[PDB]
Amino acid sequence: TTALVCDNGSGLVKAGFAGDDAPRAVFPSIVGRPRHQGVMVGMGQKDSYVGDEAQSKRGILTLKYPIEHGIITNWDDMEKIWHHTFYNELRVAPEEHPTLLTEAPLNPKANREKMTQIMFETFNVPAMYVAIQAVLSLYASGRTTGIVLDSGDGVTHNVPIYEGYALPHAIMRLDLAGRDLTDYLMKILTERGYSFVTTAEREIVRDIKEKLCYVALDFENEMATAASSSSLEKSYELPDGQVITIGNERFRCPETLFQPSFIGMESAGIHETTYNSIMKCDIDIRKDLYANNVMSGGTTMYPGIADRMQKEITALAPSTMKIKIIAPPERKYSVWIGGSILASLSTFQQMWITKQEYDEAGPSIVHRKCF
Amino acid sequence: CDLMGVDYEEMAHWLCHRKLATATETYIKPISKLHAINARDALAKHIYANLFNWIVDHVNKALHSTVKQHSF
Ligand SMILES: C/C1=C\[C@H](C)C[C@H](C)OC(=O)C[C@H](c2ccc(O)cc2)NC(=O)[C@@H](Cc2c(Br)[nH]c3ccccc23)N(C)C(=O)[C@H](C)NC(=O)[C@@H](C)C1
Ligand SMILES: Nc1ncnc2c1ncn2[C@@H]1O[C@H](COP(=O)(O)OP(=O)(O)O)[C@@H](O)[C@H]1O
Ligand SMILES: [Mg+2]
Predict the structure, then answer these.
(1) Where are the domains of chain A?
(2) Which keywords annotate this record (chain A)?
């Protein structure tokens, strides 16, 4: 029986069968409730919506994300999203299939305990495992050595790996995010006179960030260029058909990843945390980490983030030592593709947590087996 | 491409890339020279295996006869 492979996050849910080439169900991970008084009678009013439904209705709804910063922060909505994933959107009963679940490293243990408890008790999944996102990115990109940098909505984290061994002391985690880039985009957009207050407006800001932002190769030169000229300035069409024009700001937004001081944090940007993570590795491997940098997750999709990273690391790293950045176009899905590869492997079939082992040991078993 | 009829640009493009697609989006992805060679050899093996199955289907077309087979 093909195991399910499910990758949760803040932002999109990605789920599908192991051994597939690409995920079968992808939908933004939102639970929505109506906030207006239903006037019509016999409408079929519904307690709450999940996924694409909550996106379509969203003008009527309060949208709540049940995962902030890779932590599940209300378990009822998350359990609704799993219910929708197995029954509505894959249409396959969980009692048939092992399941593989995905988490950001250095999360609280209770998140794994509750997630396994809900899988065994509430869905009766015959076996389950929890993988690290960064590890799975290496399976997807076809390597056994490298420093992974993976940034989605919520968590950003670097995990160095060398010939299949992690280096826990060198793991870095940061809470820069697609989401904090979105809140920064709203707060800067206010400058030009446009105010996006409600959550359904935030979804518009998110779509502006996807379509129009790009990482400036050199920041101050493009700031001067945008001050001098309209040529950089580009415009977008809100759902109601009004147009808005956004300028230098569209490059200003994704640089905060490089300079968190804009949003107000002090911890250095993803380039300098990548370098500092390599430096926390022992001196013999470092050449191979510089030879492989693997990007993952949607927040690394910005045009020019690969070249800006390669340049700024090369500026940090000793001049002889070859720096390479590996940004595959698929990388938004590569954590799922890696989970598919892993779940397909025959050796892994040994390594599932089984329901009997859960009944014997209780939900704490996950810490013992998984990592 | 001349022998097969397929247009040169399409073979030259597809031999050096593969296509992923989710239902909503599709990515054209480059592949290593080793993977290109493995794919070319897999295409040759697949053509030959189907040509063999076809020639056997025609031999069967000559060998069959219409009366219903009671036992063999
Ligand atoms: C359709 C949208 C925007 C607009 C109608 C699109 C047009 C195109 O924007 C403009 O350029 C016009 C104008 C404007 C006025 C003077 C000016 O020197 C520059 C711009 N600014 C406005 O009408 C502001 C004024 C404002 C309120 Br109150 N508090 C705010 C807090 C911060 C900033 C500004 C404001 N305003 C009412 C809005 O944004 C409303 C709330 N916005 C929306 O519903 C969303 C869905 C986007
Ligand atoms: N092409 C793109 N450019 C910039 N940001 C993007 C792009 N595509 C998606 N994003 C943003 O990245 C985040 C989703 O990241 P992703 O890793 O897919 O989420 P998850 O952590 O759930 O897998 C969202 O903030 C989304 O708006
Ligand atoms: Mg992710």
Answers:
(1) 1-27+69-134+334-367, 28-68, 135-181+271-333, 182-270
(2) Acetylation, ADP-ribosylation, ATP-binding, Cytoplasm, Cytoskeleton, Hydrolase, Methylation, Muscle protein, Nucleotide-binding, Oxidation
